[PDB]
């Protein structure tokens, strides 16, 4: 696994996250259940939890976008990059937007919502890209066998519990 530099980390345990638009390509309901589910596989594993704001400037703030967005790193539109976030700390760090160029799906015809935002995530708290071929955090996760499948591999629990700990016992 591979920590970012200084190691940015969320210097508490309960982190908010507010989804800030919705993607035409998806129903509002399936949007919610991947964020839900891509949280909740990082939070089994750490004492980490999250809680959801409806309003008001959340830790962790998802956006769908297209092109410039307002940082300084556009998306480039169909394929390739498909998603980007910010490493622990304020305003926009923590962040994660989605390229809305792509075609969020709930299943494999098109871009993963799920697997997207739970490698996503895994940059908001704080883990870079993994050497390991079959971590999450490895670039090319996107070819990996989702959940008729999928589990986080030992190598992506190493390095969160590196930063955060075990789960409270
Ligand atoms: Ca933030
Ligand atoms: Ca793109
Ligand atoms: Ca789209
Ligand atoms: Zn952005
Ligand atoms: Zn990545």
Same mark, same amino acid.
């Given at each position: ?11 508490k ?29 990082w ?28 940082? &300084? ?6 394929? @390739?990059?498909?998603?980007?976030? #910010?490493? =622990?700390? +304020? ?14 799906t ?6 993963n919502?799920?697997?997207?935002a ?31 499948? &999928? ?6 629990? @190493?390095?969160?519990?590196?930063? #955060?700990? =075990?789960? +409270?016992?």
């Amino acid at each position: 696994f591979r920590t970012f530099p200084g190691i940015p980390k969320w210097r508490k345990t309960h982190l908010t996250y507010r989804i800030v638009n919705y993607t035409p390509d998806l129903p509002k309901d399936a949007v919610d259940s991947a964020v839900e589910k891509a949280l909740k596989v990082w939070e089994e594993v750490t004492p980490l939890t999250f809680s959801r704001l409806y309003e008001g400037e959340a830790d962790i703030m998802i956006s769908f976008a297209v092109r410039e967005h307002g940082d &300084f790193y556009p998306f480039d539109g169909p394929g @390739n990059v498909l998603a980007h976030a #910010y490493a =622990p700390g +304020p305003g926009i760090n923590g962040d994660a937007h989605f390229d809305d160029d792509e075609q969020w799906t709930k299943d494999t015809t098109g871009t993963n919502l799920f697997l997207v935002a739970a490698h996503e995530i895994g940059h908001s708290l704080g883990l870079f890209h993994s050497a390991n071929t079959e971590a999450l955090m490895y670039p090319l996760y996107h070819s990996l066998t989702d959940l008729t499948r &999928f589990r986080l591999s030992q190598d992506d629990i @190493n390095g969160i519990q590196s930063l #955060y700990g =075990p789960p +409270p016992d």
